[PDB]
Amino acid sequence: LTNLTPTELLANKAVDYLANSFLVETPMLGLLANRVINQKQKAIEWGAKVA
Amino acid sequence: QGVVGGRTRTGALANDTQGTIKGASLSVPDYYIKHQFDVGKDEIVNSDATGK
Numbered sequence: 001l002t003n004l005t006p007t008e009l010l011a012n013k014a015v016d017y018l019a020n021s022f023l024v025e026t027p028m029l030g031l032l033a034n035r036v037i038n039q040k041q042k043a044i045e046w047g048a049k050v051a
Numbered sequence: 052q053g054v055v056g057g058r059t060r061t062g063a064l065a066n067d068t069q070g071t072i073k074g075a076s077l078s079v080p081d082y083y084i085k086h087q088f089d090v091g092k093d094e095i096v097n098s099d100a101t102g103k
Contacts, residue, residue, distance in 0.1 A: 001090050005098040012101060 026033075056067040 001088065001094055005094055005102065009103040010101050012067055013103055 053069040054067045056065060058065060
């Protein structure tokens with residue numbers, strides 16, 4: 001009522017909508033992502049014919 | 052209440068005042084004990100499924 005419904009007793013249920021539309025494009029990551037190699041070693045050794 | 056009056060055993064057969072029954076009248080008055088309020092139809096709905 002004009003006074004029998006205080007704000008603090010009104011729940012005001014929200015729409016279940018979270019609004020994070022942040023920068024999430026990772027195309028450079030997107031390229032060469034599903035081919036990431038998980039080594040059991042910390043080093044990456046490969047040869048290079050330089051001459 | 053009426054008066055009781057005496058007469059000598061064989062005396063003037065008289066008349067004495069009777070009780071004056073009286074009519075009392077009240078009225079269920081033409082006035083109200085009332086509570087008048089207005090509720091906006093929003094406040095009914097804004098606080099139907101939105102009340103703690």
